[PDB]
Ligand SMILES: CCCCC/C=C\C/C=C\CCCCCCCC(=O)O[C@H](COC(=O)CCCCCCCCCCCCCCC)COP(=O)([O-])OCC[N+](C)(C)C
Ligand SMILES: CCCCC/C=C\C/C=C\CCCCCCCC(=O)O[C@H](COC(=O)CCCCCCCCCCCCCCC)COP(=O)([O-])OCC[N+](C)(C)C
Ligand SMILES: CC(C)CCC[C@@H](C)[C@H]1CC[C@H]2[C@@H]3CC=C4C[C@@H](O)CC[C@]4(C)[C@H]3CC[C@]12C
C-alpha cells in the first residue's frame with residue numbers, strides 16, 4: 001500500500017490542478033506560439049497519468065510488469081507516485097500558462113515562464129541529489145541513453161517499450177524543433193510554418209529510426225528474420241510516408257510536374273504504414289485473433305483482463321487512432337494543410353497518447369501471458 | 378488507519394480550499410454585511426479542523442479521549458474524517474463567498490448564496506439518512522440537545538466540553554442575532570450596529586448561562602460546594618461584565634450622569650472575569666502549577682506531551698487570549714467601539730477558537746491523567 005502522506009499529496013495536487021484548469025478555461029473564455037510550446041508539457045503530464053493508470057491496471061490484473069521491465073522486486077514505484085508526479089507537473093504547467101496569460105509582473109517577460117517550466121522539468125529528471133524518486137529517475141535516464149544509442153546496446157523489453165513511447169511522443173520533438181526555428185527566424189514572419197525542410201522530417205522520423213535500428217540489432221543478435229525484419233519494414237513505412245509527404249509539399253511550393261506523383265506516393269505509403277502498424281499491434285504485440293482461441297472470438301484463448309469488451313473497444317480505437325496518428329505524422333512533418341495542421345496535431349496528440357496507453361496495457365498483458373517479444377529466455 | 382480514499386478526499390478538499398482562498402483574496406484586493414454572515418461559517422470550519430488536530434494529538438499522546446467522552450470503541454471518527462468534513466464545508470463556504478463577490482447569476486440574488494450554504498450545513502448535520510457519518514451526527518445532535526437542556530439532564534464530560542466549545546463560539550450566535558436584527562429593521566441606516574439592546578446582551582450570555590446552570594446541577598447532584606460553585610461564579614463574572622457594558626452603553630446613548638460609574642464597574646468586572654477564567658483554566662482545567670511536580674516547574678507532576686515548552690506556550694497564549702476574548706465579548710455584545718468593533722471581533726474570534734483548541738488539548742490530557750472533572754468513579 002502507498003503511504004498515507006503520498007495519497008494526501010496526490011489528492012492535493014489533483015485538486016489544485018483541477019482548480020487551475022478551471023481558472024485557465026475561464027481566462028481563455030473571458031508574440032509566442034503558446035499552444036505549440038505547452039503541447040509537449042501537456043502531453044508529458046497526460047502520459048504520466050496514463051502510466052500510473054497502466055501500473056494500477058497491471059497490478060490489479062496480475063500482469064508481472066515488474067518482471068517484464070526487470071525492475072527491482074524489493075522497491076517498485078507505485079501508481080500513486082506516478083499520479084503525484086503528474087499532478088505536480090500539471091500544477092506547474094498550469095501556473096506557467098496562467099502567468100503567460102496574465103503577465104503578473106511587467107519586469108518578467110512571457111518566454112521566461114515556459115522556459116523555467118521546461119528547465120525545472122529537465123532538472124527534476126536529472127536532479128543529482130537523491131531527494132525525489134532518485135532511483136527511478138536514474139533508471140529512466142539509463143534507459144533513455146540506451147534507447148538513443150540503440151545499435152550499440154542490446155535491445156531489451158524496456159528499451160523497445162520506451163522507444164515505442166517516444167514514437168507516440170514525437171510531437172514533443174516536433175514542437176521543440178519548431179520553437180528552435182521560430183527563435184532563429186521569426187523571433188517572413190511565419191517562414192518556419194510556411195516552408196518545410198528535410199531536418200523537420202528527420203526530427204519526425206527520429207523515434208521510428210530508433211525503433212528500426214533496434215529491430216536491426218535484434219535481428220543481428222537473434223538471426224531470426226521474420227520477427228525483426230518485418231518490424232523493421234513496419235517502421236520504415238513511416239520514413240517512406242514522411243519523405244514522400246515532404247517531397248509533395250516541396251513540389252507544391254514550386255511545381256516540377258511531379259507534385260501529383262508525390263501525392264500518390266504519399267497516399268499509398270500512408271495507407272501501407274497505417275495497415276502495417278495496425279496489423280503488427282493487433283496480432284504481434286497484442287496476440288489477439290489467435291487460432292487457438294475458441295471461447296473468445298477475435299481474441300486469444302487466455303485473456304487476463306476481465307471483459308472482452310475491453311479488447312473489442314481496444315481493437316476499434318487502435319484502428320481509428322492508428323490511422324489518425326499516421327495522418328498526424330504526415331501533417332506535422334510537412335505543411336500539408338497549413339491553416340488547420342497545428343489544430344489537427346493538437347487534437348490528435350492526446351489521442352495518440354491514449355492509444356499508446358491502451359497498447360501498453362494489452363502488450364504488457366500479452367507479454368506476461370506469452371513471450372511475444374522473445375526478450376526472455 | 379484511515380481509508381486511502383479518505384486521505385485522497387482530504388487532500389483534494391484541502392487543495393481546492395487553498396486555491397479558492399487564494400482566488401478570494403485576489404478578488405478582494407482587486408447591502409449585505411458579508412463579514413458578519415460568513416464569520417460563523419469560517420469559525421465553524423476552523424473549529425472542525427482544530428478538532429481533527431485535537432483528535433490526532435490525543436491519539437498520539439495516548440490520551441483516552443474515547444473513554445473520557447464515553448464514545449463507542451469499535452466505531453470512531455478519525456481525525457482524517459474531521460479534516461475531510463472541514464475541507465468540504467470550507468470549499469462550499471468559499472464558493473458561496475465568491476458567488477456573492479461576483480454575482481455570477483443575475484437571476485439569483487446575493488442573499489441566496491449564504492442562505493443556501495448555511496441551510497446545506499444544517500441539513501447535513503441533521504440529515505436523517507444513514508450517510509455521511511450518521512452515527513456521529515446523531516450523537517452530536519443528542520449531545521447538543523442535552524447541553525441546551527442543561528438543568529434537566531445530569532452533566533457528563535461531553536456536555537460540559539460542548540458547552541465550553543459554545544462559550545468559545547458565542548460569536549456565531551452574536552452574528553445570527555445581528556443578522557436577524559438587520560433583516561427586521563435595515564431590510565435609520567445601520568440601526569442595529571449603532572445601538573445595543575438587552576436581547577443582544579442576553580444572547581451573548583447563552584453559553585455562559587448553560588455552563589453556569591450545568592455547574593449548579595452538578596453541585597446539587599454531588600453536594601460539593603468547592604468544585605462547582607466556584608466555577609458557577611466564574612461563569613457569573615461574564616454575565617456581570619456583559620450586563621455592565623450594556624448598561625454603560627445605554628447610559629452613553631441617554632445621559633444619566635452615571636455613565637462613568639458603569640464604565641468603572643464594567644472595567645472592574647472585566648478584570649475579575651478575565652482573572653477568574655484564566656486561573657480556572659491554568660489551575661483546575663489543566664492541573665498545572667502543582668506542588669507535586671518536582672522535575673517540572675509551574676506544571677503538573679505527570680506530562681504526556683513530549684515538550685514542556687508546549688505547556689509554557691499554552692500558558693502564555695491562554696493568558697493573553699483570555700483577556701482578548703473578554704474584550705471581544707464586551708465589544709460584540711455592546712456598542713463600546715462602533716467604528717472598529719466589527720474588525721476587532723473578526724480578528725479575535727479565530728484567536729478564541731485557537732485558545733479553545735489548546736485548552737481542549739490540555740484539559741483532555743489532565744482529565745486522562747487525573748479525574749479533575751469528577752465525571753468518573
Ligand atoms: C519526447 C520528450 C520526452 C518523452 C518522455 C520521456 C520519458 C518518460 C517515459 C517513461 C518513463 C518511465 C515509465 C515507467 C516504465 C516502466 C514501468 C514502471 O512503472 O517502472 C517504474 C520505473 O520508474 C521510472 O522509470 C520513473 C517513472 C517516470 C518519472 C518521471 C520523472 C520526471 C520527468 C520530467 C520530464 C522529463 C523531460 C523534460 C521535459 C521535456 C518502477 O520504478 P522503480 O523506482 O522500481 O524503478 C526502478 C529503479 N530501480 C531498478 C533502481 C529500483
Ligand atoms: C452554532 C453551532 C454549530 C454546530 C455545533 C458545533 C460543533 C459541532 C461539531 C463537533 C462537536 C462534537 C465533537 C465531539 C468530539 C469528541 C471526540 C471525538 O473526536 O470523537 C468522535 C466524536 O465524533 C462525533 O461525535 C462527530 C464530531 C463532529 C463531526 C462533524 C459533523 C458535522 C457538523 C456540521 C455543523 C453544522 C452547523 C451549522 C450551523 C448551525 C468519535 O466519533 P464516533 O463516530 O465514535 O461518534 C460517536 C458515534 N457513536 C456514539 C455512535 C459511536
Ligand atoms: C472511448 C473508447 C473508444 C476508448 C476504448 C475503451 C477504453 C475506455 C477501454 C480500452 C481498454 C480498457 C482498459 C483495459 C484494462 C483495464 C484494467 C482493469 O483492471 C481496469 C479497467 C481497465 C483500465 C480498462 C479501462 C477501459 C479501457 C481504457
Ligand SMILES: CC(C)CCC[C@@H](C)[C@H]1CC[C@H]2[C@@H]3CC=C4C[C@@H](O)CC[C@]4(C)[C@H]3CC[C@]12C
Pocket residue numbers: 433434437438682687688690691693694735738
Ligand atoms: C502564541 C505563542 C506564544 C504560543 C503558540 C503555541 C502553540 C502554537 C502551541 C501550544 C500547544 C501546542 C500543541 C501541544 C500538543 C501538540 C500535540 C503533538 O502531538 C503535536 C503538536 C501539538 C499539536 C502542539 C502544537 C503547538 C501548540 C498548538
